[PDB]
Design a protein around this ligand. Structure first.
Ligand SMILES: [Cl-]
Ligand SMILES: [Cl-]
Length: 138
C-alpha cells in the first residue's frame, strides 16, 4: 500500500472529523487556520477549488495561506497539550507554513512510503482543535 497515516496527535476531547471524501475535489490548494493566544482554534482545507466544512471554534483570528500550483505538503510538524497548539506545513517548494504558538509536546510527521504527499487531514474538534492526523498518499 502507498497510503500511510501520521497521528493521532492531541487529546480525546471533541468529536471526530475527517476530510477523507474531500480528496476527490482535488489536491490541497490552500489552508485556513484559526488561532488564538494559546491554541489552534479551527481548521479549513481547500481541496482543488472547494473548501472543506469548517471545523473547530470561533474564538480566534483566521490565518489563510494559498499554495502554488503543484505545491505539495511533504512534512507536518506541530505541538499540542490537551489541544493542538502549533502546526508547520513543509512543502516541496521549500516553504514552511507555520501557525500558532511554539509550546507543548512536539510531533514530526513524515510520509511512510515513496513519493507520497499530504492528501487529507482528520482529527478531533469542538470549540478548538483537540487532535490532528495526517493522511499521506500518491
Ligand atoms: Cl485510522
Ligand atoms: Cl469553496
Amino acid at each position: 500500500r502507498s497510503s500511510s497515516y501520521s497521528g493521532e496527535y492531541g487529546s480525546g476531547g471533541g468529536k471526530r472529523f475527517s476530510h477523507s471524501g474531500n480528496q476527490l475535489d482535488g489536491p490541497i490548494t490552500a489552508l485556513r487556520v484559526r488561532v488564538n493566544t494559546y491554541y489552534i482554534v479551527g481548521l479549513q482545507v481547500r481541496y482543488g477549488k472547494v473548501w472543506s466544512d469548517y471545523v473547530g471554534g470561533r474564538n480566534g483570528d483566521l490565518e489563510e495561506i494559498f499554495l502554488h500550483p503543484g505545491e505539495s505538503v511533504i512534512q507536518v510538524s506541530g505541538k499540542y497539550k490537551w489541544y493542538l497548539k502549533k502546526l508547520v506545513f513543509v512543502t516541496d517548494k521549500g516553504r514552511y507554513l507555520s501557525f500558532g504558538k511554539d509550546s507543548g509536546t512536539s510531533f514530526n510527521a513524515v510520509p511512510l512510503h515513496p513519493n507520497t504527499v499530504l492528501r487529507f487531514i482528520s482529527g478531533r474538534s469542538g470549540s478548538l482543535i483537540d487532535a490532528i492526523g495526517l493522511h499521506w498518499d500518491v
